[PDB]
Swiss-Prot record:
Assembly: Homodimer.
Cystine pairs: none
Residue positions where N6-(pyridoxal phosphate)lysine is found in the record: 238
Name this protein carries in UniProt: 8-amino-7-oxononanoate synthase
Originating species: Paraburkholderia xenovorans (strain LB400)
Gene behind the chain: bioF
Function: Catalyzes the decarboxylative condensation of pimeloyl-[acyl-carrier protein] and L-alanine to produce 8-amino-7-oxononanoate (AON), [acyl-carrier protein], and carbon dioxide.
Amino acid sequence: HHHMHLLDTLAEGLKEIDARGLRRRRRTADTPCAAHMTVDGRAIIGFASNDYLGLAAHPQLIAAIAEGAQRYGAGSGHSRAHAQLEDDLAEFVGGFVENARALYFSTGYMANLATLTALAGRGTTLFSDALNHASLIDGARLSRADVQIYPHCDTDALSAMLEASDADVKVIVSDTVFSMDGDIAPLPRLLELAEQHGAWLIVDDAHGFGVLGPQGRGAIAQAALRSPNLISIGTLDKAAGVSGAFVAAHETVIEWLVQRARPYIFTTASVPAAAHAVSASLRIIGGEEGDARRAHLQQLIGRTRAMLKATPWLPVDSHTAVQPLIIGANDATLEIAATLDRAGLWVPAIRPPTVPTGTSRLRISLSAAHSQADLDRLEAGLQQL
């Protein structure tokens, strides 16, 4: 009956997590991801997912999964569906550069990792927005480059850091929509600085793809940017409602990634049915149904912004589906989330280190699948709190 003494340190750390209010609960969904979902046998309205267009449970995407598996098999063992998706993505999101290509990756993390390891090295300096999500942080540390953090969206500070750098290779890295705040990065000014200093501008559009710009092509498209310095990363498990991720860039950039990125990064792939279903999702996102879903989401955002302002708490000023409400402490945030959970509304409580100390917050995530009746109930829940 041997005992591993390090189990004791884990057990003590878990108890400390309970006391400090940082315990995480994983809930099991009895029904598909959607506006209304059943959890533990009780139907609730969910504001927790990043299913921004309501596509995760869409009948056309369910059908595309089934069709994709019948055509290409259950597992990948580069399927024809993966190759076709790369063509479809280049056409949809590559408008910022002539002769765009795209690469499909299993996860957003892998997409970031492939891009940074291929382009960054010793002698590269990487300039990173302070609120960038942790995957981008992790990808950069692996790159073996010097990482300099510029203050959030502070392009004057970044301009001063760029000129105070003699590096042979400079890379600027920013999320487009910040996942816990909802604000949109100053891409026009960031790109100006990138061209002036001869730097790559790598932008992660995880939370802007599908919901920003003409036909939902994303944040670069919204900013109407055109430059070969741009490298566009996105994920396909949020607005697109399936799984996977992409890098889109000038074909020379893509070919360099194929030749220089760590080969194991290409050895993982989602099931072929997933790639086939993303191609179907692009047709919805870019079509009249996508336009209608986005227009409805914009109306939900407009109502929710004022709803949050009416509460005693401080909203983060967001024009995207991410609608945070700052409470303050962990305990006070968990208490309010539980009051909403009792009213049948699932609103996550975000806590450090995900967010700065003293800014624990509800993260209300809107979806085009939500109705005005759903916001009626969220409002009543907030008004009662």
